Design an enzyme around this catalytic site. Structure first.
Site, PDB file in Angstrom:
ATOM      1  N   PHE A   1       1.971   9.793   3.172  1.00 49.97           N
ATOM      2  CA  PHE A   1       2.471   9.708   4.533  1.00 49.97           C
ATOM      3  C   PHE A   1       3.076   8.349   4.881  1.00 49.97           C
ATOM      4  CE2 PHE A   1      -2.105   8.911   4.833  1.00 49.97           C
ATOM      5  CZ  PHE A   1      -2.063   7.659   5.433  1.00 49.97           C
ATOM      6  N   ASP A   2       2.794   7.284   4.128  1.00 48.72           N
ATOM      7  CA  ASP A   2       3.368   6.006   4.477  1.00 48.72           C
ATOM      8  C   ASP A   2       3.299   5.105   3.244  1.00 48.72           C
ATOM      9  OD1 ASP A   2       4.812   4.437   6.483  1.00 48.72           O
ATOM     10  OD2 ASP A   2       3.013   3.148   6.517  1.00 48.72           O
TER      11      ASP A   2
ATOM     12  N   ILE B   1      -7.790   0.213  10.583  1.00 48.98           N
ATOM     13  CA  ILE B   1      -8.956   1.065  10.547  1.00 48.98           C
ATOM     14  C   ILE B   1     -10.106   0.380   9.808  1.00 48.98           C
ATOM     15  CG2 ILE B   1      -7.750   3.235  10.918  1.00 48.98           C
ATOM     16  CD1 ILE B   1      -7.800   3.693   7.857  1.00 48.98           C
TER      17      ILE B   1
ATOM     18  N   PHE C   1      -5.901   5.446  -0.042  1.00 53.71           N
ATOM     19  CA  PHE C   1      -4.901   4.411  -0.122  1.00 53.71           C
ATOM     20  C   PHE C   1      -4.900   3.761  -1.481  1.00 53.71           C
ATOM     21  CE2 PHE C   1      -3.395   3.853   4.237  1.00 53.71           C
ATOM     22  CZ  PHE C   1      -4.387   4.477   4.984  1.00 53.71           C
TER      23      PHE C   1
ATOM     24  N   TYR D   1       0.811  -1.192   0.000  1.00 53.25           N
ATOM     25  CA  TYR D   1       0.000   0.000   0.000  1.00 53.25           C
ATOM     26  C   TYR D   1       0.851   1.250   0.000  1.00 53.25           C
ATOM     27  CZ  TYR D   1       1.079   0.789   4.960  1.00 53.25           C
ATOM     28  OH  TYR D   1       1.711   0.955   6.151  1.00 53.25           O
TER      29      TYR D   1
ATOM     30  N   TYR E   1      -9.389   7.732  11.356  1.00 48.02           N
ATOM     31  CA  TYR E   1      -8.909   8.182  12.678  1.00 48.02           C
ATOM     32  C   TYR E   1      -9.751   9.304  13.266  1.00 48.02           C
ATOM     33  CZ  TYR E   1      -4.977   5.146  11.587  1.00 48.02           C
ATOM     34  OH  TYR E   1      -4.208   4.082  11.239  1.00 48.02           O
TER      35      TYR E   1
HETATM   36  C1  LIG Z   1       1.437   1.795  10.474  1.00 48.24           C
HETATM   37  C2  LIG Z   1       0.749   0.829   9.859  1.00 48.24           C
HETATM   38  C3  LIG Z   1      -0.783   0.820   9.724  1.00 48.24           C
HETATM   39  C4  LIG Z   1      -1.444   1.500  10.898  1.00 48.24           C
HETATM   40  N1  LIG Z   1      -2.907   1.181  11.026  1.00 48.24           N
HETATM   41  C5  LIG Z   1      -3.307   0.616  12.320  1.00 48.24           C
HETATM   42  C6  LIG Z   1      -2.838   1.462  13.456  1.00 48.24           C
HETATM   43  C7  LIG Z   1      -2.194   0.898  14.558  1.00 48.24           C
HETATM   44  C8  LIG Z   1      -1.793   1.691  15.609  1.00 48.24           C
HETATM   45  C9  LIG Z   1      -2.082   3.045  15.548  1.00 48.24           C
HETATM   46  C10 LIG Z   1      -2.703   3.561  14.433  1.00 48.24           C
HETATM   47  N2  LIG Z   1      -3.093   2.778  13.399  1.00 48.24           N
HETATM   48  C11 LIG Z   1      -3.857   1.387  10.078  1.00 48.24           C
HETATM   49  O1  LIG Z   1      -5.023   0.993  10.290  1.00 48.24           O
HETATM   50  C12 LIG Z   1      -3.593   2.029   8.772  1.00 48.24           C
HETATM   51  C13 LIG Z   1      -3.968   1.074   7.611  1.00 48.24           C
HETATM   52  C14 LIG Z   1      -2.932  -0.043   7.495  1.00 48.24           C
HETATM   53  C15 LIG Z   1      -1.554   0.537   7.275  1.00 48.24           C
HETATM   54  C16 LIG Z   1      -1.152   1.516   8.335  1.00 48.24           C
HETATM   55  N3  LIG Z   1      -2.206   2.521   8.595  1.00 48.24           N
HETATM   56  S1  LIG Z   1      -2.018   4.042   7.977  1.00 48.24           S
HETATM   57  O2  LIG Z   1      -1.296   3.984   6.694  1.00 48.24           O
HETATM   58  C17 LIG Z   1      -0.831   4.675   9.150  1.00 48.24           C
HETATM   59  C18 LIG Z   1       0.536   4.683   8.855  1.00 48.24           C
HETATM   60  C19 LIG Z   1       1.417   5.200   9.818  1.00 48.24           C
HETATM   61 CL1  LIG Z   1       3.103   5.180   9.502  1.00 48.24          CL
HETATM   62  C20 LIG Z   1       0.943   5.670  11.018  1.00 48.24           C
HETATM   63  C21 LIG Z   1      -0.390   5.649  11.265  1.00 48.24           C
HETATM   64 CL2  LIG Z   1      -0.968   6.282  12.769  1.00 48.24          CL
HETATM   65  C22 LIG Z   1      -1.301   5.172  10.352  1.00 48.24           C
END
Ligand SMILES: C=C[C@H]1CN(Cc2ccccn2)C(=O)[C@@H]2CCC[C@H]1N2[S@](=O)c1cc(Cl)cc(Cl)c1
Ligand SMILES: [Cl-]
Ligand SMILES: [Cl-]
Ligand SMILES: [Cl-]
Ligand SMILES: [Cl-]
Ligand SMILES: [Cl-]
Ligand SMILES: [Cl-]
Length: 107
Positions: A36-37, A56, A99, A26, A82
């Site tokens: 951001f990621d 999420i 995404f 992703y 969030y």
């Molecule tokens: C970092 C990896 C996950 C994070 N999470 C779950 C999650 C776990 C803990 C705190 C916040 N969100 C998520 O549900 C979603 C979807 C899956 C991919 C990423 N995220 S987001 O891209 C995300 C990416 C990053 Cl580096 C930080 C945060 Cl707080 C959120």
């Protein structure tokens, strides 16, 4: 909610099931496209278990509507992400997220 728009086709038949380990690549963006990621940049497939609510809501429901091999865009409202609070330092308040997801495998 979450809207899923196809980018490249999967098999049209094999969908994530509760309790499976879902393996994806992703990239995550704010609504305006600011990345951001990315698992791609890390070269590390990302895994989560369907139904565990460890990601999420827009992922639980959005990735579950993809078939294996599909690439799709998920547009996720704040209430399926969030929320009002966001995740300070990376997800701002009341953020709609976009995404680009590829469903690689189910295990
Ligand atoms: C970092 C990896 C996950 C994070 N999470 C779950 C999650 C776990 C803990 C705190 C916040 N969100 C998520 O549900 C979603 C979807 C899956 C991919 C990423 N995220 S987001 O891209 C995300 C990416 C990053 Cl580096 C930080 C945060 Cl707080 C959120
Ligand atoms: Cl997992
Ligand atoms: Cl996990
Ligand atoms: Cl798990
Ligand atoms: Cl923030
Ligand atoms: Cl609103
Ligand atoms: Cl909004």
């Amino acid at each position: 909610g979450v809207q899923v728009e196809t980018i490249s086709p999967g098999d049209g038949r094999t969908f994530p099931k509760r309790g499976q380990t879902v393996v994806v690549h992703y990239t995550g963006m704010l609504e305006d496209g600011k990345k951001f990621d990315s698992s791609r940049d890390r070269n590390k497939p990302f895994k989560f278990m369907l139904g565990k609510q460890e990601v999420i809501r827009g992922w639980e429901e959005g990735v579950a509507q993809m078939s294996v091999g599909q690439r799709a865009k998920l547009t996720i409202s704040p209430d399926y992400a969030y929320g009002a609070t966001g995740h300070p330092g990376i997800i701002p308040p009341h953020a709609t997220l976009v995404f680009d997801v590829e469903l690689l495998k189910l295990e």
